Design a protein around this ligand. Structure first.
Ligand SMILES: [Cl-]
Length: 290
C-alpha cells in the first residue's frame, strides 16, 4: 500500500497518504485516486502486466495530439513509465457506474446535443496525423470487409444461430448502412467514459480503443439507448459541427449493436478462458425460449 506512494514519489509526485483511494477491480490497470500536498487531484494507472504498455504507448501519443483539437478535457499524462501513468483528475462525474447506476438519462436533449458536438470535433481531426500515432487505420472498404472477416473467424470456431447470421449477412450486403468515409474514432464511446457536469460532457476517458474507421462507432450506443428523436438531436449537432452522417446510419448502429456476439467470439479466441467462450457460444447460439 505505501509502496504506491514510494512509486509515486520516485516519479516526483508526493501524494497524501490519507486521501489515497484504490480502484482494484480493473483488468489492464489498477487505478488509484489521490490528492497531492499541493491539493491537486491525481489518477494513478498502474499497469498490471507488460502487455498493456503498447496500447498505453499509442494512447499517450494520441492524447498529445488530441488536446488542442477538442473543447472537452482529455487525460493530460504528465507521468508515463513502465510502472505508472499519472494524470490530473478530470472534472465531472461519469454518466454510468457498475450495481448498474446511471447518472444521465439517455433521453436527455442536453446530453445528446453535447455528444454530437464532441463526436463531430473528434471526427473533424486530420486522420493521417492521427494515423502517425500508431492506431489501427481502416478505409471504408476495410471497415466493411473487417466484419466480413470477423464473421468468418467466429463462424469457424463457434456455431452461430441462423437468425443472427442471416441478419448480419443482410446487414453486410445493404450498401445503405455503410459509411463512405473514415474518421478518427474513440472506439468505445458510452457514458462510462463520458464525464458530465449538468448533463454536458466535460471530459472523455480511456482512448485505448482509438482508431481510424467507421464514424458510426462513437454514435452507436446513443442510437441504441436513446429515443429516436433524441438521437437526431445528436445527429443535428453532429452535422452542424462538421460531421457527415449518411441516411442509413441509425439502422447501421442498431445492426452493429446486434453483432456484439461476434465481438464476444473474437474476445474468447484471444483470451482462451473456457468461461469466456462459454458465454460467446451462448450469445452466438441462443437456446430455445421456454
Ligand atoms: Cl520506462
Amino acid at each position: 500500500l505505501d509502496a504506491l506512494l514510494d512509486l509515486a514519489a520516485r516519479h516526483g509526485l508526493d501524494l497524501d497518504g490519507g486521501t489515497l483511494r484504490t480502484e482494484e477491480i480493473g483488468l489492464d490497470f489498477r487505478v488509484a485516486f489521490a490528492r497531492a500536498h499541493d491539493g491537486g487531484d491525481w489518477v494513478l494507472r498502474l499497469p498490471r502486466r507488460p502487455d498493456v504498455l503498447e496500447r498505453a504507448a499509442v494512447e499517450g501519443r494520441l492524447l498529445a495530439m488530441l488536446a488542442p483539437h477538442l473543447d472537452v478535457a482529455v487525460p493530460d499524462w504528465r507521468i508515463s513509465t513502465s510502472e505508472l501513468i499519472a494524470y490530473p483528475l478530470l472534472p465531472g462525474s461519469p454518466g454510468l457506474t457498475v450495481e448498474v447506476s446511471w447518472h444521465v438519462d439517455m433521453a436527455s436533449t442536453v446530453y445528446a446535443r453535447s455528444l454530437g458536438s464532441v463526436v463531430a470535433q473528434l471526427h473533424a481531426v486530420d486522420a493521417e496525423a492521427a494515423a502517425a500515432t500508431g492506431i489501427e487505420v481502416r478505409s471504408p472498404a476495410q471497415v466493411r470487409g473487417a466484419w466480413r472477416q470477423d464473421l468468418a473467424r467466429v463462424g469457424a470456431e463457434f456455431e452461430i444461430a441462423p437468425a443472427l447470421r442471416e441478419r448480419w449477412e443482410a446487414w453486410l450486403a445493404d450498401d445503405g448502412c455503410w459509411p463512405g468515409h473514415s474518421v478518427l474514432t474513440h472506439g468505445e464511446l458510452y457514458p462510462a467514459h463520458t464525464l458530465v457536469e449538468d448533463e454536458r460532457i466535460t471530459a472523455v476517458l480511456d482512448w485505448t480503443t482509438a482508431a481510424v474507421g467507421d464514424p458510426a462507432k462513437d454514435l452507436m450506443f446513443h442510437q441504441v439507448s436513446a429515443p429516436s428523436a433524441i438521437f437526431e438531436v445528436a445527429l443535428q449537432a453532429y452535422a452542424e459541427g462538421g460531421g457527415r452522417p449518411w441516411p442509413g446510419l441509425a439502422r447501421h448502429c442498431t445492426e452493429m449493436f446486434s453483432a456484439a456476439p461476434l465481438g464476444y467470439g473474437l474476445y474468447a479466441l484471444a483470451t482462451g478462458e473456457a468461461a469466456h467462450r462459454e458465454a460467446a457460444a451462448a450469445a452466438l447460439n441462443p437456446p430455445e425460449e421456454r
